[PDB]
PDB file of C-alpha atoms in Angstrom:
ATOM      1  CA  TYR A   1      27.100 -52.220 105.734  1.00 44.92           C
ATOM      2  CA  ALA A   2      25.837 -50.172 102.795  1.00 48.81           C
ATOM      3  CA  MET A   3      26.796 -46.784 104.250  1.00 51.47           C
ATOM      4  CA  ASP A   4      30.429 -47.667 104.978  1.00 51.40           C
ATOM      5  CA  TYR A   5      31.126 -50.212 102.237  1.00 50.70           C
ATOM      6  CA  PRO A   6      30.467 -48.444  98.936  1.00 52.60           C
ATOM      7  CA  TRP A   7      30.019 -50.212  95.612  1.00 52.84           C
ATOM      8  CA  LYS A   8      33.545 -49.195  94.578  1.00 52.52           C
ATOM      9  CA  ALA A   9      35.283 -51.384  97.182  1.00 52.21           C
ATOM     10  CA  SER A  10      32.871 -54.257  97.872  1.00 51.34           C
ATOM     11  CA  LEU A  11      33.894 -57.741  96.832  1.00 53.88           C
ATOM     12  CA  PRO A  12      30.933 -59.638  95.316  1.00 57.95           C
ATOM     13  CA  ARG A  13      31.270 -62.512  97.829  1.00 56.21           C
ATOM     14  CA  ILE A  14      31.676 -61.025 101.324  1.00 60.75           C
ATOM     15  CA  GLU A  15      28.086 -59.846 101.750  1.00 62.53           C
ATOM     16  CA  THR A  16      26.655 -62.905  99.985  1.00 62.19           C
ATOM     17  CA  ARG A  17      27.853 -64.792 103.046  1.00 59.33           C
ATOM     18  CA  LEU A  18      26.456 -61.986 105.202  1.00 55.80           C
ATOM     19  CA  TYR A  19      23.136 -61.934 103.332  1.00 60.26           C
ATOM     20  CA  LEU A  20      22.453 -65.439 104.650  1.00 59.68           C
ATOM     21  CA  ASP A  21      23.012 -64.102 108.155  1.00 58.41           C
ATOM     22  CA  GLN A  22      20.416 -61.331 107.664  1.00 59.97           C
ATOM     23  CA  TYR A  23      17.576 -63.065 105.763  1.00 59.06           C
ATOM     24  CA  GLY A  24      14.583 -64.547 107.547  1.00 60.87           C
ATOM     25  CA  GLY A  25      12.801 -66.082 104.573  1.00 60.06           C
ATOM     26  CA  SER A  26       9.050 -66.663 104.817  1.00 58.38           C
ATOM     27  CA  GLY A  27       9.065 -65.779 108.515  1.00 60.26           C
ATOM     28  CA  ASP A  28       8.780 -62.121 107.517  1.00 62.91           C
ATOM     29  CA  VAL A  29       5.439 -60.404 106.936  1.00 65.66           C
ATOM     30  CA  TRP A  30       4.316 -57.340 104.992  1.00 66.85           C
ATOM     31  CA  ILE A  31       1.465 -55.194 106.277  1.00 73.05           C
ATOM     32  CA  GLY A  32      -1.149 -53.314 104.317  1.00 73.29           C
ATOM     33  CA  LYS A  33      -4.828 -52.993 104.829  1.00 72.40           C
ATOM     34  CA  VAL A  34      -4.515 -56.702 105.651  1.00 76.90           C
ATOM     35  CA  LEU A  35      -1.190 -58.373 106.444  1.00 75.68           C
ATOM     36  CA  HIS A  36       0.075 -61.003 104.052  1.00 75.64           C
ATOM     37  CA  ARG A  37       3.006 -63.025 102.741  1.00 72.59           C
ATOM     38  CA  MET A  38       4.545 -63.633  99.286  1.00 72.28           C
ATOM     39  CA  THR A  39       5.849 -67.083  98.383  1.00 73.79           C
ATOM     40  CA  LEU A  40       6.978 -66.353  94.839  1.00 75.48           C
ATOM     41  CA  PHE A  41       9.126 -63.766  96.632  1.00 73.50           C
ATOM     42  CA  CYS A  42      10.133 -65.261 100.010  1.00 75.31           C
ATOM     43  CA  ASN A  43      10.338 -68.967 100.858  1.00 79.35           C
ATOM     44  CA  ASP A  44      12.304 -71.380 102.989  1.00 77.41           C
ATOM     45  CA  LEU A  45      13.616 -72.695  99.668  1.00 79.31           C
ATOM     46  CA  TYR A  46      15.740 -69.874  98.266  1.00 80.39           C
ATOM     47  CA  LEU A  47      17.823 -70.431 101.396  1.00 82.32           C
ATOM     48  CA  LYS A  48      17.813 -74.155 100.622  1.00 80.93           C
ATOM     49  CA  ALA A  49      19.212 -73.404  97.182  1.00 82.62           C
ATOM     50  CA  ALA A  50      21.723 -70.974  98.681  1.00 80.58           C
ATOM     51  CA  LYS A  51      22.772 -73.028 101.703  1.00 79.62           C
ATOM     52  CA  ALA A  52      23.370 -75.885  99.271  1.00 79.92           C
ATOM     53  CA  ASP A  53      25.490 -74.352  96.524  1.00 78.31           C
ATOM     54  CA  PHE A  54      27.379 -71.774  98.583  1.00 79.65           C
ATOM     55  CA  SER A  55      28.061 -74.375 101.279  1.00 77.79           C
ATOM     56  CA  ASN A  56      29.692 -76.832  98.895  1.00 75.85           C
ATOM     57  CA  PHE A  57      31.515 -73.900  97.276  1.00 77.62           C
ATOM     58  CA  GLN A  58      32.850 -73.097 100.741  1.00 80.51           C
ATOM     59  CA  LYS A  59      33.604 -76.811 100.944  1.00 80.02           C
ATOM     60  CA  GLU A  60      35.221 -77.246  97.538  1.00 79.28           C
ATOM     61  CA  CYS A  61      37.413 -74.143  97.705  1.00 80.71           C
ATOM     62  CA  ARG A  62      39.073 -74.764 101.080  1.00 79.03           C
ATOM     63  CA  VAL A  63      40.514 -78.032  99.784  1.00 78.04           C
ATOM     64  CA  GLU A  64      41.976 -75.950  96.932  1.00 78.38           C
ATOM     65  CA  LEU A  65      43.982 -73.685  99.241  1.00 81.24           C
ATOM     66  CA  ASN A  66      44.977 -76.941 100.936  1.00 81.80           C
ATOM     67  CA  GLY A  67      46.242 -77.963  97.508  1.00 82.28           C
ATOM     68  CA  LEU A  68      47.591 -74.494  96.782  1.00 84.31           C
ATOM     69  CA  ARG A  69      49.551 -74.555 100.043  1.00 81.31           C
ATOM     70  CA  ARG A  70      52.299 -77.044  99.269  1.00 79.99           C
ATOM     71  CA  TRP A  71      53.151 -75.707  95.784  1.00 77.15           C
ATOM     72  CA  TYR A  72      54.110 -72.405  97.409  1.00 76.58           C
ATOM     73  CA  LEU A  73      56.162 -74.386  99.925  1.00 75.06           C
ATOM     74  CA  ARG A  74      57.962 -76.672  97.453  1.00 74.57           C
ATOM     75  CA  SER A  75      58.849 -74.418  94.529  1.00 74.85           C
ATOM     76  CA  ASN A  76      61.681 -72.748  96.556  1.00 78.82           C
ATOM     77  CA  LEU A  77      59.972 -69.344  96.400  1.00 77.57           C
ATOM     78  CA  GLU A  78      58.620 -69.187  99.974  1.00 75.43           C
ATOM     79  CA  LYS A  79      62.090 -68.606 101.491  1.00 77.88           C
ATOM     80  CA  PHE A  80      62.421 -64.823 101.290  1.00 78.63           C
ATOM     81  CA  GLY A  81      59.948 -61.946 101.177  1.00 80.00           C
ATOM     82  CA  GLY A  82      57.677 -61.261 104.132  1.00 79.52           C
ATOM     83  CA  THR A  83      57.883 -62.240 107.765  1.00 81.62           C
ATOM     84  CA  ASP A  84      55.723 -65.336 107.261  1.00 79.87           C
ATOM     85  CA  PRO A  85      54.302 -67.145 104.218  1.00 77.10           C
ATOM     86  CA  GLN A  86      50.899 -68.133 105.546  1.00 74.77           C
ATOM     87  CA  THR A  87      49.247 -64.729 105.903  1.00 75.18           C
ATOM     88  CA  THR A  88      50.367 -63.748 102.407  1.00 74.67           C
ATOM     89  CA  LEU A  89      49.130 -67.120 101.129  1.00 77.86           C
ATOM     90  CA  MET A  90      45.614 -66.644 102.465  1.00 79.13           C
ATOM     91  CA  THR A  91      45.410 -62.977 101.490  1.00 76.74           C
ATOM     92  CA  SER A  92      46.430 -63.614  97.875  1.00 78.44           C
ATOM     93  CA  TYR A  93      43.833 -66.377  97.423  1.00 78.46           C
ATOM     94  CA  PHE A  94      40.992 -64.420  99.003  1.00 76.47           C
ATOM     95  CA  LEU A  95      40.860 -61.582  96.458  1.00 73.71           C
ATOM     96  CA  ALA A  96      41.641 -64.149  93.754  1.00 73.21           C
ATOM     97  CA  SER A  97      38.628 -66.332  94.617  1.00 74.77           C
ATOM     98  CA  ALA A  98      36.004 -63.978  96.041  1.00 74.28           C
ATOM     99  CA  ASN A  99      35.641 -62.517  92.542  1.00 70.85           C
ATOM    100  CA  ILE A 100      35.447 -65.768  90.564  1.00 69.51           C
ATOM    101  CA  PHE A 101      33.487 -68.321  92.513  1.00 69.34           C
ATOM    102  CA  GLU A 102      32.109 -70.962  90.133  1.00 67.17           C
ATOM    103  CA  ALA A 103      33.596 -74.425  89.738  1.00 65.00           C
ATOM    104  CA  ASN A 104      34.178 -74.324  85.973  1.00 63.89           C
ATOM    105  CA  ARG A 105      36.745 -71.485  85.839  1.00 68.19           C
ATOM    106  CA  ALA A 106      39.145 -72.743  88.530  1.00 66.36           C
ATOM    107  CA  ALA A 107      41.999 -72.750  85.999  1.00 62.88           C
ATOM    108  CA  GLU A 108      41.604 -68.987  85.706  1.00 62.40           C
ATOM    109  CA  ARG A 109      41.011 -68.724  89.453  1.00 60.49           C
ATOM    110  CA  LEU A 110      44.039 -70.586  90.791  1.00 59.70           C
ATOM    111  CA  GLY A 111      46.281 -69.372  87.990  1.00 61.13           C
ATOM    112  CA  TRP A 112      45.438 -65.841  89.067  1.00 60.13           C
ATOM    113  CA  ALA A 113      46.459 -66.551  92.658  1.00 61.42           C
ATOM    114  CA  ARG A 114      49.764 -68.116  91.605  1.00 61.86           C
ATOM    115  CA  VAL A 115      51.115 -65.141  89.632  1.00 60.93           C
ATOM    116  CA  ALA A 116      49.652 -63.000  92.412  1.00 60.28           C
ATOM    117  CA  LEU A 117      52.228 -64.526  94.761  1.00 59.68           C
ATOM    118  CA  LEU A 118      54.927 -64.413  92.080  1.00 60.10           C
ATOM    119  CA  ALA A 119      55.246 -60.676  91.534  1.00 56.48           C
ATOM    120  CA  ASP A 120      55.192 -59.446  95.141  1.00 55.92           C
ATOM    121  CA  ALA A 121      57.841 -61.618  96.795  1.00 55.06           C
ATOM    122  CA  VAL A 122      60.119 -60.398  94.018  1.00 52.27           C
ATOM    123  CA  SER A 123      58.789 -56.878  94.629  1.00 56.26           C
ATOM    124  CA  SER A 124      60.007 -57.347  98.195  1.00 54.69           C
ATOM    125  CA  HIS A 125      63.346 -58.639  96.913  1.00 55.58           C
ATOM    126  CA  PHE A 126      64.204 -55.527  94.874  1.00 54.03           C
ATOM    127  CA  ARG A 127      63.918 -52.965  97.673  1.00 54.18           C
ATOM    128  CA  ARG A 128      65.901 -55.227 100.033  1.00 53.68           C
ATOM    129  CA  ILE A 129      68.863 -54.844  97.662  1.00 55.04           C
ATOM    130  CA  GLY A 130      67.906 -51.336  96.552  1.00 55.82           C
ATOM    131  CA  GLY A 131      66.378 -51.623  93.101  1.00 54.18           C
ATOM    132  CA  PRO A 132      67.582 -53.442  89.987  1.00 53.56           C
ATOM    133  CA  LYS A 133      71.016 -51.820  89.912  1.00 52.11           C
ATOM    134  CA  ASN A 134      72.731 -54.472  92.070  1.00 52.08           C
ATOM    135  CA  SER A 135      70.686 -57.601  91.319  1.00 51.53           C
ATOM    136  CA  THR A 136      72.517 -60.427  89.569  1.00 50.49           C
ATOM    137  CA  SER A 137      70.244 -63.472  89.797  1.00 52.38           C
ATOM    138  CA  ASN A 138      68.234 -64.009  86.630  1.00 50.03           C
ATOM    139  CA  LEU A 139      64.565 -63.271  87.134  1.00 48.34           C
ATOM    140  CA  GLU A 140      62.857 -64.488  83.961  1.00 45.97           C
ATOM    141  CA  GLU A 141      63.463 -68.096  85.055  1.00 44.79           C
ATOM    142  CA  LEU A 142      61.161 -67.810  88.090  1.00 42.31           C
ATOM    143  CA  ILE A 143      58.258 -67.675  85.622  1.00 44.98           C
ATOM    144  CA  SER A 144      58.775 -71.387  84.892  1.00 44.76           C
ATOM    145  CA  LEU A 145      57.688 -72.436  88.408  1.00 42.17           C
ATOM    146  CA  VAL A 146      54.165 -72.325  86.998  1.00 44.32           C
ATOM    147  CA  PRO A 147      53.672 -75.670  85.195  1.00 45.38           C
ATOM    148  CA  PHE A 148      53.931 -75.825  81.429  1.00 47.48           C
ATOM    149  CA  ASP A 149      50.643 -76.021  79.579  1.00 46.88           C
ATOM    150  CA  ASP A 150      50.381 -75.509  75.836  1.00 46.59           C
ATOM    151  CA  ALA A 151      47.186 -73.456  75.651  1.00 46.07           C
ATOM    152  CA  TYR A 152      48.312 -71.008  78.355  1.00 43.22           C
ATOM    153  CA  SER A 153      52.031 -70.744  79.020  1.00 40.18           C
ATOM    154  CA  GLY A 154      53.175 -69.558  75.592  1.00 41.32           C
ATOM    155  CA  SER A 155      52.198 -65.894  75.672  1.00 41.47           C
TER     156      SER A 155
ATOM    157  CA  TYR B   1      71.578 -92.234  38.786  1.00 43.26           C
ATOM    158  CA  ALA B   2      69.792 -95.481  39.666  1.00 43.04           C
ATOM    159  CA  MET B   3      72.970 -97.531  40.247  1.00 42.25           C
ATOM    160  CA  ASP B   4      74.349 -95.419  43.105  1.00 44.22           C
ATOM    161  CA  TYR B   5      71.295 -93.747  44.698  1.00 46.28           C
ATOM    162  CA  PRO B   6      69.432 -96.301  46.810  1.00 52.06           C
ATOM    163  CA  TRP B   7      66.042 -95.719  48.398  1.00 52.53           C
ATOM    164  CA  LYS B   8      67.882 -94.829  51.616  1.00 50.73           C
ATOM    165  CA  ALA B   9      69.730 -92.134  49.606  1.00 53.05           C
ATOM    166  CA  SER B  10      67.155 -90.885  47.057  1.00 52.93           C
ATOM    167  CA  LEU B  11      65.571 -87.506  47.757  1.00 51.90           C
ATOM    168  CA  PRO B  12      62.217 -86.446  46.282  1.00 54.01           C
ATOM    169  CA  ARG B  13      63.329 -83.174  44.638  1.00 55.99           C
ATOM    170  CA  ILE B  14      66.805 -83.985  43.292  1.00 53.56           C
ATOM    171  CA  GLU B  15      65.027 -86.894  41.581  1.00 53.68           C
ATOM    172  CA  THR B  16      62.533 -84.743  39.683  1.00 55.91           C
ATOM    173  CA  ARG B  17      65.222 -82.407  38.350  1.00 53.05           C
ATOM    174  CA  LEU B  18      67.225 -85.403  37.151  1.00 49.05           C
ATOM    175  CA  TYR B  19      64.383 -86.802  35.043  1.00 52.22           C
ATOM    176  CA  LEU B  20      63.473 -83.629  33.130  1.00 53.29           C
ATOM    177  CA  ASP B  21      66.777 -83.998  31.281  1.00 55.01           C
ATOM    178  CA  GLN B  22      65.762 -87.484  30.036  1.00 54.06           C
ATOM    179  CA  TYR B  23      62.053 -86.802  29.526  1.00 57.46           C
ATOM    180  CA  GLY B  24      60.701 -87.002  26.000  1.00 54.74           C
ATOM    181  CA  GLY B  25      57.007 -86.207  26.045  1.00 56.25           C
ATOM    182  CA  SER B  26      55.388 -87.154  22.756  1.00 51.91           C
ATOM    183  CA  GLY B  27      58.858 -87.390  21.196  1.00 52.40           C
ATOM    184  CA  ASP B  28      59.366 -90.750  22.927  1.00 54.32           C
ATOM    185  CA  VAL B  29      58.271 -93.567  20.622  1.00 53.77           C
ATOM    186  CA  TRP B  30      57.293 -97.094  21.640  1.00 55.35           C
ATOM    187  CA  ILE B  31      58.000-100.365  19.840  1.00 53.64           C
ATOM    188  CA  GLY B  32      55.513-103.223  19.927  1.00 54.79           C
ATOM    189  CA  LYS B  33      54.809-105.545  17.044  1.00 54.52           C
ATOM    190  CA  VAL B  34      54.631-102.252  15.110  1.00 54.55           C
ATOM    191  CA  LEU B  35      56.319 -98.938  15.862  1.00 54.30           C
ATOM    192  CA  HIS B  36      53.431 -97.173  17.547  1.00 56.39           C
ATOM    193  CA  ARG B  37      52.506 -94.292  19.819  1.00 55.59           C
ATOM    194  CA  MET B  38      50.525 -93.946  23.023  1.00 56.95           C
ATOM    195  CA  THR B  39      49.336 -90.366  23.268  1.00 58.44           C
ATOM    196  CA  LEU B  40      47.947 -90.355  26.833  1.00 54.47           C
ATOM    197  CA  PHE B  41      50.828 -90.278  29.293  1.00 51.66           C
ATOM    198  CA  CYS B  42      53.608 -90.252  26.723  1.00 56.18           C
ATOM    199  CA  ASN B  43      52.615 -86.638  25.990  1.00 58.15           C
ATOM    200  CA  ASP B  44      54.569 -83.453  25.284  1.00 60.85           C
ATOM    201  CA  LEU B  45      52.362 -81.048  27.274  1.00 59.85           C
ATOM    202  CA  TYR B  46      53.142 -83.137  30.376  1.00 62.21           C
ATOM    203  CA  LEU B  47      56.748 -81.968  30.028  1.00 62.64           C
ATOM    204  CA  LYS B  48      55.462 -78.391  29.970  1.00 62.06           C
ATOM    205  CA  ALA B  49      53.080 -79.286  32.801  1.00 61.18           C
ATOM    206  CA  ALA B  50      55.725 -80.253  35.358  1.00 58.48           C
ATOM    207  CA  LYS B  51      58.078 -77.482  34.232  1.00 60.23           C
ATOM    208  CA  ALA B  52      55.289 -75.010  34.941  1.00 62.09           C
ATOM    209  CA  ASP B  53      55.091 -76.772  38.326  1.00 61.09           C
ATOM    210  CA  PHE B  54      58.856 -76.483  38.784  1.00 63.21           C
ATOM    211  CA  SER B  55      59.642 -72.814  38.089  1.00 64.49           C
ATOM    212  CA  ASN B  56      57.185 -71.469  40.678  1.00 65.42           C
ATOM    213  CA  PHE B  57      58.712 -73.964  43.077  1.00 65.67           C
ATOM    214  CA  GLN B  58      62.100 -72.318  42.567  1.00 64.74           C
ATOM    215  CA  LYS B  59      60.744 -68.765  42.751  1.00 65.53           C
ATOM    216  CA  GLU B  60      60.216 -69.211  46.476  1.00 66.66           C
ATOM    217  CA  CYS B  61      63.574 -70.963  46.652  1.00 66.77           C
ATOM    218  CA  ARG B  62      65.281 -67.621  46.063  1.00 69.28           C
ATOM    219  CA  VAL B  63      63.119 -65.378  48.246  1.00 65.93           C
ATOM    220  CA  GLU B  64      63.255 -67.682  51.258  1.00 65.62           C
ATOM    221  CA  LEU B  65      66.999 -67.689  50.682  1.00 64.24           C
ATOM    222  CA  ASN B  66      67.066 -63.880  50.639  1.00 67.64           C
ATOM    223  CA  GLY B  67      64.582 -63.861  53.506  1.00 64.59           C
ATOM    224  CA  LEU B  68      66.684 -66.112  55.706  1.00 64.38           C
ATOM    225  CA  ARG B  69      70.017 -64.478  54.895  1.00 62.77           C
ATOM    226  CA  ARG B  70      69.033 -61.195  56.536  1.00 65.14           C
ATOM    227  CA  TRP B  71      67.961 -62.989  59.715  1.00 64.22           C
ATOM    228  CA  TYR B  72      71.182 -64.960  60.117  1.00 64.38           C
ATOM    229  CA  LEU B  73      73.302 -61.787  60.022  1.00 64.51           C
ATOM    230  CA  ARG B  74      71.497 -59.737  62.662  1.00 61.52           C
ATOM    231  CA  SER B  75      71.143 -62.653  65.107  1.00 61.35           C
ATOM    232  CA  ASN B  76      74.877 -62.239  66.121  1.00 59.08           C
ATOM    233  CA  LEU B  77      75.529 -65.886  65.276  1.00 58.53           C
ATOM    234  CA  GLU B  78      78.459 -65.540  62.846  1.00 58.03           C
ATOM    235  CA  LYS B  79      80.618 -65.181  65.934  1.00 55.27           C
ATOM    236  CA  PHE B  80      80.141 -68.939  66.065  1.00 53.71           C
ATOM    237  CA  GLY B  81      79.626 -71.156  63.057  1.00 54.19           C
ATOM    238  CA  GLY B  82      81.692 -72.519  60.224  1.00 52.72           C
ATOM    239  CA  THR B  83      84.101 -70.262  58.360  1.00 51.55           C
ATOM    240  CA  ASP B  84      81.785 -70.290  55.333  1.00 49.95           C
ATOM    241  CA  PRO B  85      78.386 -69.519  56.904  1.00 49.24           C
ATOM    242  CA  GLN B  86      76.592 -68.688  53.638  1.00 53.18           C
ATOM    243  CA  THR B  87      77.229 -72.147  52.229  1.00 54.69           C
ATOM    244  CA  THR B  88      76.554 -73.573  55.693  1.00 57.15           C
ATOM    245  CA  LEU B  89      73.213 -71.800  55.387  1.00 59.21           C
ATOM    246  CA  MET B  90      73.006 -73.250  51.881  1.00 59.41           C
ATOM    247  CA  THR B  91      73.698 -76.798  53.058  1.00 61.00           C
ATOM    248  CA  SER B  92      71.090 -76.494  55.814  1.00 58.08           C
ATOM    249  CA  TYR B  93      68.149 -74.901  54.006  1.00 58.91           C
ATOM    250  CA  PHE B  94      68.574 -77.090  50.907  1.00 58.66           C
ATOM    251  CA  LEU B  95      68.355 -80.211  53.071  1.00 57.31           C
ATOM    252  CA  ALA B  96      64.846 -79.008  54.003  1.00 60.94           C
ATOM    253  CA  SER B  97      63.814 -77.632  50.597  1.00 61.37           C
ATOM    254  CA  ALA B  98      64.832 -80.809  48.800  1.00 60.13           C
ATOM    255  CA  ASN B  99      62.605 -82.713  51.238  1.00 62.83           C
ATOM    256  CA  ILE B 100      59.455 -80.615  51.533  1.00 62.83           C
ATOM    257  CA  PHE B 101      58.624 -79.224  48.106  1.00 65.50           C
ATOM    258  CA  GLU B 102      54.937 -78.420  48.547  1.00 66.04           C
ATOM    259  CA  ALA B 103      54.168 -74.727  48.877  1.00 67.23           C
ATOM    260  CA  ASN B 104      52.064 -73.995  51.960  1.00 67.24           C
ATOM    261  CA  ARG B 105      54.242 -75.951  54.396  1.00 69.22           C
ATOM    262  CA  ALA B 106      56.706 -73.047  54.519  1.00 66.60           C
ATOM    263  CA  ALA B 107      56.445 -72.838  58.315  1.00 67.49           C
ATOM    264  CA  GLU B 108      57.756 -76.397  58.441  1.00 68.41           C
ATOM    265  CA  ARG B 109      60.419 -75.455  55.894  1.00 66.83           C
ATOM    266  CA  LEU B 110      61.620 -72.354  57.746  1.00 68.27           C
ATOM    267  CA  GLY B 111      61.566 -73.940  61.198  1.00 70.20           C
ATOM    268  CA  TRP B 112      63.580 -76.965  60.122  1.00 73.10           C
ATOM    269  CA  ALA B 113      66.151 -74.505  58.815  1.00 72.23           C
ATOM    270  CA  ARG B 114      66.058 -72.012  61.683  1.00 71.95           C
ATOM    271  CA  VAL B 115      66.401 -74.596  64.449  1.00 66.55           C
ATOM    272  CA  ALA B 116      69.178 -76.551  62.753  1.00 65.74           C
ATOM    273  CA  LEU B 117      71.458 -73.517  62.690  1.00 65.56           C
ATOM    274  CA  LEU B 118      71.366 -72.614  66.383  1.00 67.12           C
ATOM    275  CA  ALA B 119      71.287 -76.311  67.295  1.00 66.97           C
ATOM    276  CA  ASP B 120      74.356 -77.071  65.178  1.00 65.05           C
ATOM    277  CA  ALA B 121      76.449 -73.937  65.715  1.00 62.10           C
ATOM    278  CA  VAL B 122      76.425 -74.559  69.470  1.00 61.59           C
ATOM    279  CA  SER B 123      78.081 -77.915  68.812  1.00 63.76           C
ATOM    280  CA  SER B 124      81.003 -76.038  67.286  1.00 64.26           C
ATOM    281  CA  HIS B 125      81.165 -73.925  70.462  1.00 63.70           C
ATOM    282  CA  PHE B 126      81.609 -76.935  72.733  1.00 67.40           C
ATOM    283  CA  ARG B 127      84.601 -78.229  70.722  1.00 67.80           C
ATOM    284  CA  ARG B 128      86.568 -75.302  72.146  1.00 69.23           C
ATOM    285  CA  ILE B 129      85.478 -75.270  75.784  1.00 68.47           C
ATOM    286  CA  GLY B 130      85.678 -79.039  76.444  1.00 67.59           C
ATOM    287  CA  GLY B 131      82.021 -79.901  77.052  1.00 68.79           C
ATOM    288  CA  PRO B 132      79.401 -78.502  79.405  1.00 69.41           C
ATOM    289  CA  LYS B 133      81.899 -78.411  82.299  1.00 71.85           C
ATOM    290  CA  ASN B 134      83.746 -75.218  81.385  1.00 71.34           C
ATOM    291  CA  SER B 135      80.693 -73.223  80.271  1.00 70.80           C
ATOM    292  CA  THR B 136      80.248 -69.549  81.089  1.00 69.06           C
ATOM    293  CA  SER B 137      76.582 -68.751  80.440  1.00 70.05           C
ATOM    294  CA  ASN B 138      73.043 -70.126  80.206  1.00 72.61           C
ATOM    295  CA  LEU B 139      72.768 -71.928  76.857  1.00 70.76           C
ATOM    296  CA  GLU B 140      68.972 -72.070  77.244  1.00 74.22           C
ATOM    297  CA  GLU B 141      68.368 -68.519  76.005  1.00 75.49           C
ATOM    298  CA  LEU B 142      68.957 -69.157  72.291  1.00 72.19           C
ATOM    299  CA  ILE B 143      65.307 -69.416  71.204  1.00 75.19           C
ATOM    300  CA  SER B 144      65.044 -65.603  71.350  1.00 73.87           C
ATOM    301  CA  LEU B 145      66.211 -65.709  67.732  1.00 73.89           C
ATOM    302  CA  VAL B 146      63.111 -67.795  66.915  1.00 72.42           C
ATOM    303  CA  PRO B 147      59.927 -65.829  66.069  1.00 73.20           C
ATOM    304  CA  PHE B 148      57.060 -65.845  68.563  1.00 72.76           C
ATOM    305  CA  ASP B 149      53.877 -67.439  67.380  1.00 72.38           C
ATOM    306  CA  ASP B 150      51.409 -67.476  70.259  1.00 73.43           C
ATOM    307  CA  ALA B 151      50.418 -71.079  69.549  1.00 74.43           C
ATOM    308  CA  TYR B 152      53.765 -72.457  68.392  1.00 72.20           C
ATOM    309  CA  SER B 153      56.341 -70.965  70.760  1.00 71.10           C
ATOM    310  CA  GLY B 154      56.195 -72.485  74.224  1.00 68.88           C
ATOM    311  CA  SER B 155      56.130 -76.180  73.366  1.00 70.90           C
TER     312      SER B 155
END
C-alpha cells in the first residue's frame, strides 16, 4: 500500500480501516537474545478502543447519507446532470467525510458535501448548452436550496 | 403645542426643540408666599447644557443627509419614486432621526431609512402595472443596494 499510495494522494481514513485488517495485537512477538512481548505497546485493547469508536462512526455516518439522500432528491436539483444520481451522491460524500470524521463537526462535514453536489451538476449544465452565452435561467437562486441559517448563510 | 399633539402624536425630538424656545433657566422666577428662587433645576447653565447636547446632535444630521444623498443617486432608483425625491428622502430620514436621537445607534438610523425607500418606491411601481400579475422581472433582487455586513445581511 505504501509504495503505490503516496502521502500526496492518501485519504486519512481509507487505511485506518485497512490498518484494522492488518494488525494482530498482542499475538505478535519480537525476538532478541530472548523473545518477548510489549503490552504498553501492543494489546488486545487498542483494538477494543478502535473497534468501538470507528465502528459507531461507521454506524453513525451511514444514517447521515441516508438522511442526505432525500434532500438531493426533493430539492429539484437531481433531474439533470449525470446519467444517475446515486453514484455521484456516494462519491461526493466519501471525500467530504473521509477527511473530517468526528461527530462534533458534522455541520462542516455535511455542508461541505451539499455545495459539493451544487457546483458540478451546474458544471454539467453549462457544457450541455455550450457555455454561459446561451443560458437564460437565473443561477444565483439555486444557492438558496441550502437551508437558511444566520451564522452561516450570510457570507 | 399641548392642545393638539396627543401622546399618540408626540415625537421625542420635535418636543425638545419646541421647549428651548420657552425655557428660562435661572431667569424663571417662582411665586410662593414670597417671590423666591430655586437654584437647582431652575438653572441657566441647564439651558446651555441641553443646547450643547443639541448642536452635536444636528452635526450628524447634515452629514448623514449628505452621506445618504450620494447613495440614492447612484442606486438607479430615481427612475421610480416621487417627482420630488430629495424631499421624499427628507420625509423618510427625518421620520427616523426624529425618533432615534441617540448617537451610536446610527446603524438603526440608516437602515430604517435605507429600507423604507426601496420598500416604498416599489409601491409606486405597482400602481402602473396593476399588481403582481403584470410584472416583468424578479422583484427580490433589490437588496443589492443594501450594504453587506457579514452578520447583518442574510436575515
